[PDB]
Amino acid sequence: VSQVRQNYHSDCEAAVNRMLNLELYASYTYSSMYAFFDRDDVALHNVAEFFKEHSHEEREHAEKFMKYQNKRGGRVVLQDIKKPERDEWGNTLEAMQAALQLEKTVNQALLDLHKLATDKVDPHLCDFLESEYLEEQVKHIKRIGDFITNLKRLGLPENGMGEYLFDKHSVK
Amino acid sequence: VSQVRQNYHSDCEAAVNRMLNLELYASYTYSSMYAFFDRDDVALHNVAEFFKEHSHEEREHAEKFMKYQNKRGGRVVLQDIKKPERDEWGNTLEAMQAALQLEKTVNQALLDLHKLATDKVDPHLCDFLESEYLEEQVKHIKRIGDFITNLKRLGLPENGMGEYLFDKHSVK
Amino acid sequence: VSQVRQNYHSDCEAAVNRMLNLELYASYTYSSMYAFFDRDDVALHNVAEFFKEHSHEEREHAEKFMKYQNKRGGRVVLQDIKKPERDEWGNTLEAMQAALQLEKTVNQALLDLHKLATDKVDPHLCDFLESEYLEEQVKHIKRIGDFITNLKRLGLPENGMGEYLFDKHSVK
Amino acid sequence: VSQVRQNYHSDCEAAVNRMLNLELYASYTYSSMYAFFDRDDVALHNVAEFFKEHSHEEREHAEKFMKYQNKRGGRVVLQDIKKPERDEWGNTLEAMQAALQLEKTVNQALLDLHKLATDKVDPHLCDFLESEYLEEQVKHIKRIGDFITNLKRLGLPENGMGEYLFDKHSVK
Ligand SMILES: [Cl-]
Ligand SMILES: [Cl-]
Ligand SMILES: [Cl-]
Ligand SMILES: [Cl-]
Ligand SMILES: [Cl-]
Ligand SMILES: [Cl-]
Ligand SMILES: [Cl-]
Ligand SMILES: [Cl-]
Ligand SMILES: [Cl-]
Ligand SMILES: [Cl-]
Ligand SMILES: [Cl-]
Ligand SMILES: [Cl-]
Ligand SMILES: [Cl-]
Ligand SMILES: [Cl-]
Ligand SMILES: [Cl-]
Ligand SMILES: [Cl-]
Ligand SMILES: [Cl-]
Ligand SMILES: [Cl-]
Ligand SMILES: [Cl-]
Ligand SMILES: [Cl-]
Ligand SMILES: [Cl-]
Ligand SMILES: [Cl-]
Ligand SMILES: [Cl-]
Ligand SMILES: [Cl-]
Ligand SMILES: [Co+2]
Ligand SMILES: [Co+2]
Ligand SMILES: [Co+2]
Ligand SMILES: [Co+2]
Ligand SMILES: [Co+2]
Ligand SMILES: [Co+2]
Ligand SMILES: [Co+2]
Ligand SMILES: [Co+2]
Ligand SMILES: [Co+2]
Ligand SMILES: [Co+2]
Ligand SMILES: [Co+2]
Ligand SMILES: [Co+2]
Ligand SMILES: [Co+2]
Ligand SMILES: [Mg+2]
Ligand SMILES: [Mg+2]
Ligand SMILES: [Mg+2]
Ligand SMILES: [Mg+2]
Ligand SMILES: [Mg+2]
Ligand SMILES: [Mg+2]
Ligand SMILES: [Mg+2]
Ligand SMILES: [Mg+2]
Ligand SMILES: [Mg+2]
Ligand SMILES: [Mg+2]
Ligand SMILES: [Mg+2]
Ligand SMILES: [Mg+2]
Ligand SMILES: [Mg+2]
Ligand SMILES: [Mg+2]
Ligand SMILES: [Mg+2]
Ligand SMILES: [Mg+2]
Ligand SMILES: [Mg+2]
Ligand SMILES: [Mg+2]
Ligand SMILES: [Mg+2]
Ligand SMILES: [Mg+2]
Ligand SMILES: [Mg+2]
């Protein structure tokens, strides 16, 4: 094994690689959302830029797992980054609903990794998750849920005026 | 009696303690409103922060009565702070309507204390009320009444778009 | 359930509401202590201001739990804030002794919530407790215990000169 | 009558002159206290300077009544300023006790003037009293009462060390 490796279970190493892939997948989904809202027949630029920012954040999350893996003496193993589920995202409400579910999927995988880390008695991995990932997921989920509530209040999907207002006053 | 006490009737001392409790009660009600508007299924953050600011203001009003009591040689006597009337506040209009009534309740109690102070020939307590409390109540009542008028104009409770617009352009 | 809720047990939600109430209770107790030391027949202003600062800190702790509850998709449920145990606090030593016990009561409730969070496999709630509450309790308990030791050394309760010296050189 | 005079009763004019004299009397008493604490066989300089500052404040209070009288179209009528009650003031405790009573005497005369102003339906004089005098008396009385409490705690009159400590840590 690596000269640095200490208290790092093979199962945790593998799960970190799988989580890295999911972070990359999330990044790629958000890129798709950005591109959709930048279309000339969609044209909600503030919405598009929200999703672009999230794409960048997810890619950073992936980089941080690569660094983590190496610090522990594990080995980064990459897999294909699957294309997003959809090619088109409907409207701001549908997209935010998809984003909420994505963030919850990410969160569940982080929680599952934390449970594995617990089971393997790996406090360093627990700490990393708790300090760098779990709170940010709660914040994202809350923000996107708040947006959904507001989009519903604004009459989405039918109310175009409401959609316009959201883009111009919410997506700060 | 206290070495400092001069021209301070026992009835006024007791009424100051009761008023302190009401200020605390008002603070607590506004906290409830803050929490409600911060819910993910409510999500009117500017509204929530208006109510949080008012909660803080009411707590300051209570502190000022504690200090007043001691300055006059009275004795602070605390009672339980009753929980708010409601657990949930409906929407911005209902909440503002409740706030208006709360502010009027507070005002009436301040006015009643001023009448007692008058009857007991306590110009210092009259002055304190007039200089630190009575005008601020008039301002609050006016502001919240103006908000109500605007929420009605905006089509509350039914018009969600109107509610959104209020949160984004009024609650400065 | 709330659209945001994920891995948040009903028991933990309820326990967060109970803890919020205890934080508020602690705030209110410290306010009483402030008022007592501000009395003209007590007149230990630095002591009074220590307790006022702690009252404000506890209220902030309560606010942070309200925000936490909403972030997780729980619902803030308020109860009455019970008045403090005592109306008068004796002297600096007795008050500090009461404060120590209050801080220990708060701490025990935080520790119990952490155990519940552990049992329910809620690492986010564990982290929140560990990062925002548990260390601050240890610091408070240590500070107040150190004060007690010094008040005893200074001859409290009988030695008034010692009490004066403490107010003028310790309560920074 | 004076061309300016409006709603100013002769009784109120006379009472303002009497109050002016009392302010001057209070100033003179505090000067005596200053001189006593500056004696080489007393030598409590911070105490002395507290009393000197109060002497100056009382003289300012007197000047403000002279200006008030002229503004209303009354006529300043001066009387002798009686020498203080005592030539020597014992110690810090006795002096503070005398100061408390002086401040209460001043306050009672202000309150009596306010009652006369009320009876004569003179809101301008009421306002002047409330805005420029009555609160400052409450503050002085509270401060001096707090000092007394501390001097007693410090073992005055017998405890010289306590008296020294008060001069060096209280009279800010
Ligand atoms: Cl290993
Ligand atoms: Cl292994
Ligand atoms: Cl992108
Ligand atoms: Cl598609
Ligand atoms: Cl849709
Ligand atoms: Cl985080
Ligand atoms: Cl009285
Ligand atoms: Cl009475
Ligand atoms: Cl609040
Ligand atoms: Cl309700
Ligand atoms: Cl309604
Ligand atoms: Cl005011
Ligand atoms: Cl859940
Ligand atoms: Cl549950
Ligand atoms: Cl307080
Ligand atoms: Cl008691
Ligand atoms: Cl004791
Ligand atoms: Cl902490
Ligand atoms: Cl006239
Ligand atoms: Cl006349
Ligand atoms: Cl002088
Ligand atoms: Cl004499
Ligand atoms: Cl004496
Ligand atoms: Cl004043
Ligand atoms: Co991520
Ligand atoms: Co990067
Ligand atoms: Co842990
Ligand atoms: Co983020
Ligand atoms: Co108030
Ligand atoms: Co405050
Ligand atoms: Co205000
Ligand atoms: Co606390
Ligand atoms: Co706060
Ligand atoms: Co602290
Ligand atoms: Co004066
Ligand atoms: Co002058
Ligand atoms: Co003054
Ligand atoms: Mg090797
Ligand atoms: Mg392996
Ligand atoms: Mg495929
Ligand atoms: Mg941690
Ligand atoms: Mg953190
Ligand atoms: Mg937000
Ligand atoms: Mg007494
Ligand atoms: Mg009474
Ligand atoms: Mg009840
Ligand atoms: Mg005013
Ligand atoms: Mg206005
Ligand atoms: Mg729902
Ligand atoms: Mg439940
Ligand atoms: Mg009870
Ligand atoms: Mg920490
Ligand atoms: Mg220390
Ligand atoms: Mg003429
Ligand atoms: Mg005349
Ligand atoms: Mg004579
Ligand atoms: Mg004033
Ligand atoms: Mg003071």
UniProtKB/Swiss-Prot annotation, chains A, B, C, D:
MF annotations from Gene Ontology: ferric iron binding; ferrous iron binding; ferroxidase activity
Subunit structure: Oligomer of 24 subunits. The functional molecule is roughly spherical and contains a central cavity into which the polymeric mineral iron core is deposited.
Catalysed transformations (reactions): 4 Fe(2+) + O2 + 4 H(+) = 4 Fe(3+) + 2 H2O
Disulfide bonds: none
Amino-acid positions noted as binding Fe cation 1 in the UniProt annotation, renumbered to this chain: E23, E58, H61
Function: Stores iron in a soluble, non-toxic, readily available form. Important for iron homeostasis. Has ferroxidase activity. Iron is taken up in the ferrous form and deposited as ferric hydroxides after oxidation.
Domain Ferritin-like diiron: 6-155
GO BP: any one term: intracellular iron ion homeostasis
SUPFAM superfamilies named in the record: Ferritin-like (SSF47240)
Catalytic EC class: oxidoreductase
EC id: 1.16.3.1
The protein's name in its UniProt record: Ferritin, middle subunit
Miscellaneous field: There are three types of ferritin subunits in amphibia: L, M and H chains. M and H chains are fast mineralizing; the L chain is very slow mineralizing.
Keywords of the record: Iron, Iron storage, Metal-binding, Oxidoreductase
